[PDB]
Design a protein around this ligand. Structure first.
Ligand SMILES: CC[C@@H](CNc1ncnc2nc[nH]c12)NC(=O)CCc1ccccc1
Length: 167
């Protein structure tokens, strides 16, 4: 038994809620919050910009040091950094950005990173500002992640559509 509340069960291991991931993080303080990152860990908008603002830019400062040492992530890749005031850890995961021509098949690789963590609070990768089909992202999540994932979907209208269309 964990501290996530009001989630709808989709599968054995996938749960979903209409919520802002930042507000869920602040309330739950989960072991792992997933950031919808880009390869440069430049946190400007969506999940990344919202989480970073909630850390008072500490996430960006830490990320800039990570990139200066290690160089960019791969599309489909990830790194574990601090969760600051929001979680123990933040798993920065790079889904493909359709608005940049990246291969949607890399979305499965992106979700595979979740399997290294027993429980995660996460957003829908590659959807929203990243330009890919959200029904598809949820399907890839369900078919790829085997650990326990609590999905926070910000847009009410999209949350209703994801639930109603779920197979
Ligand atoms: C489905 C991907 C998520 C990712 N972004 C976030 N997910 C969770 N919490 C967040 N807090 C700040 N951004 C958040 N985008 C949204 O839900 C809203 C954008 C949108 C509007 C209309 C149709 C589809 C998508």
């Amino acid at each position: 038994v964990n501290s996530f509340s009001g989630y709808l069960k989709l599968t054995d291991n996938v749960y979903i809620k209409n919520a802002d991931i930042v507000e869920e993080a602040k309330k739950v303080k989960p072991t792992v919050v997933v950031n919808a990152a880009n390869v440069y860990l430049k946190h400007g908008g969506g999940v990344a910009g919202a989480l970073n603002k909630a850390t008072n830019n500490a996430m960006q400062v830490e990320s800039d040091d990570y990139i200066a040492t290690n160089g960019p992530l791969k599309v489909g890749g990830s790194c574990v950094l601090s969760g600051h005031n929001l979680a123990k850890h933040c798993l920065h995961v790079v889904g493909p950005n359709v608005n940049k021509g990246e291969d949607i098949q890399l979305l499965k690789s992106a979700y595979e990173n979740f399997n290294q963590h027993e429980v995660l609070l996460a957003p829908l990768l590659s959807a929203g500002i990243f330009g890919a089909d959200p029904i598809h992202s949820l399907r890839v999540c369900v078919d790829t992640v085997r650990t326990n994932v609590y999905l926070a979907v910000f847009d009410k209208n999209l949350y209703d559509k994801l639930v109603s269309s779920f197979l």
